[model samples]
Target chain A: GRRKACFVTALTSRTELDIDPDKLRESVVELLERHPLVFEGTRQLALQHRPEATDPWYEGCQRQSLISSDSDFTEVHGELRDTYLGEVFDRLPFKPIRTRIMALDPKYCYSVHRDLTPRYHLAVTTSEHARFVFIEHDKVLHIPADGDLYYVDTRQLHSAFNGGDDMAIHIVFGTD
Target chain B: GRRKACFVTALTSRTELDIDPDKLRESVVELLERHPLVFEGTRQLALQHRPEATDPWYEGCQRQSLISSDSDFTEVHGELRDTYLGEVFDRLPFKPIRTRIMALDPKYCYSVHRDLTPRYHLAVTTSEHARFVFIEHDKVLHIPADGDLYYVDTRQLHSAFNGGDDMAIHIVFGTD
Candidate 1:
């Protein structure tokens, strides 16, 4: 046949990209100086899935408002977020979007929960991984990196734990 | 005079909320059905700052991306996500705007940051504050609680550590 049309099921799958460590450290230093810390309650946070209804405030969750609301964030990327992400996204065939970071700390074993969207990816860059963990059936993923990248399908059964001594800095993005 | 006007700085300076240990265990049991892990990356993440940028993702820091688009998140708020939050947020005489849950690993360390709007109050609910700590005047804070809460300014520079065998959970909120 001269030409034929084809369709790829495009089932969701993830890949990891390795970033430059020096480049990441430099950026982190600048970022640490200016950021906001927000929370829902103090004692009510669910750890290991313990219900403490006496104080709903303490049991509630917390998060930073919209991150892209400021211009400083974009300045850090200097169009690099797009350039760098664009290059990697093209190869992995992910949703065309960026990730947002939230320093997370939750205490407990977790269930397999997905996000609000049906399509997305998990690109990570961290100092280590063990406090909050991710699960995929028989696999236990502990994030570890200085300047690295990994594209993952979050739809898979996954969870997080914070038995370590630090908050988790994570970035979420879309792969359209 | 029959009545007088009064103003309080923090509505939640001293508050306590108790929870049922049995319910907590049940929730954990169900949540475990999906998965129980936070994956790890291969290297470190880059940090960045900015005097001015186009898009401000949660502040001047754009190191990680936290995906909130997961699907199962809504279910986690079972019975209102708190045993005592209902009391603290309501009785404190403040209106809440947002709530969220976060997951972290050892590779992550929170930097110093603050909120744009002055928060009326903040409470730390550590399902597991594993190495839960706070820094003020270059000092650290450690805690493990039941029906206890911490009223502090998240705008302050703080960091957490979980050097234990489990994850740390913290819930925070704001007021109007």
Candidate 2:
């Protein structure tokens, strides 16, 4: 359980994409400011539903899954969608799948579950006390944010834990 | 002329030292104001020597080897000394070395040279128009500064160049 892994499904060429981490973080902050309602999925201790996980036991994870872009939230989403990710991953087939800024609260956690599609994440605010863990092929991985965008195979068993002071914020997006 | 080596003989733990790079830069600017003479060694494109490099060619390289702990210049040196380096590297045995800010001009460069000791560098203001290259064993190494402390093996065949706008400034020092 101590071993960490780099389960990189795809990597972007640094020369081709200049995804400035600082600007990305600033965009997230702006989205939160201009559109507060973007944060709607704040179900305390209520686990969000996933097509892969049927059991409601995975609920009750203290998190707010805000939607920055979707079929419904187009204006704010379209404005921010083209800011960072669109600039770097221009070739990817992107869909409006509840791209949100999710904040994991203190002493909050998400039970292990798998996702149907691969997900991309940009760490906006990370805490040293919190961690993202993934178990794949009988190995545990500790995911730490390095102020850049990253691809995660959520198809594997994954969970998040935060016992720190500040909320761990991340910009999460799904790709087709 | 194509080699890259560790060039680092020693290391320092980030946790062991509480050096805020931003604060360090600010303090340095303050010291420079109180004593304009700190810019005395700014003999444009002048190469200052370390105890390791004595060749005549090492001279006339753009740099300022200001003293922070010397008998004559100790007045201004001691004042700026404890501001950054002295506080963090309190236990390190420092001497009258080239322990000051160094700037490389846009057209300035260092001819390859090897040293007997390791030198430390903290990039304060780095322009995108500069580069630090070294040849260790059989390959050339490119070192980029990110406003952090880094150790260089002065023992490697190394040189620095600036081809872009603005000077590449760094706080360079050596210790036993």
Question: Which runs of model 1 end up more than 4 angstroms from their true locations?
Answer: A1-16, A37-95, A106-112, A116-136, B1-176
Model 2: residues with Cα > 4 Å off, grouped in runs: A1-176, B1-18, B34-76, B81-98, B136-147
Error of 1 at A66 (Å): 11
Model 2 chain B: which ten-residue window has the lowest total lDDT? B38-47
Model-by-model lDDT, in order?
Answer: 0.34, 0.45
**Clash totals in order:** 113, 18
TM-scores for all predictions: 0.31, 0.33
B86-173: candidate 1 lDDT, tens digit per residue:
4343444434433222333432334333333323322232333233222233333334444344454444433344433334433343
* Cα RMSD to the true fold for all candidates: 23.7, 16.1
Q: After the best TM-score superposition of candidate 2, give how far the Cα of residue A99 lies from its true spot, in angstroms.
A: 52
Please state the i-RMS of candidate 2. Answer: 22.8
User: Candidate 2, residues B46-98: lDDT per residue as tens digits?
Assistant: 12343333431223232325332222221113333456645544533444243
